[PDB]
């Protein structure tokens, strides 16, 4: 009898890109919005994973 070990899944990590970059900051968030969808796209990619 032999044992074969294979991974199946990753930890389902999800990162809030706005909180990560501009935590509790209105002034920072307003500047972050000048980058358009970059923040949203990152959240989407992690959701997909």
């Amino acid at each position: 009898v032999t044992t074969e070990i294979l991974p199946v899944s990753m930890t389902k990590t999800s990162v809030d890109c706005t909180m990560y970059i501009c935590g509790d900051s209105t002034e920072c968030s307003n500047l972050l919005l000048q980058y358009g969808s970059f923040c949203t796209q990152l959240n989407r990619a992690l959701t997909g994973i």
Partner: protein, 49 residues
Amino acid sequence: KYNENGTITDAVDCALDPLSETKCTLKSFTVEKGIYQTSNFRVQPTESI
């Protein structure tokens, strides 16, 4: 929502209720069956120390 003639015919109030939040997040007036992440619940400060 702007129609073919450039007239605003509808709108979503992005802070009215949780479904409106989903419609706003997905940039659509139609939401398909499923679970969507739309926001981040945050307790606000009540005192200034």
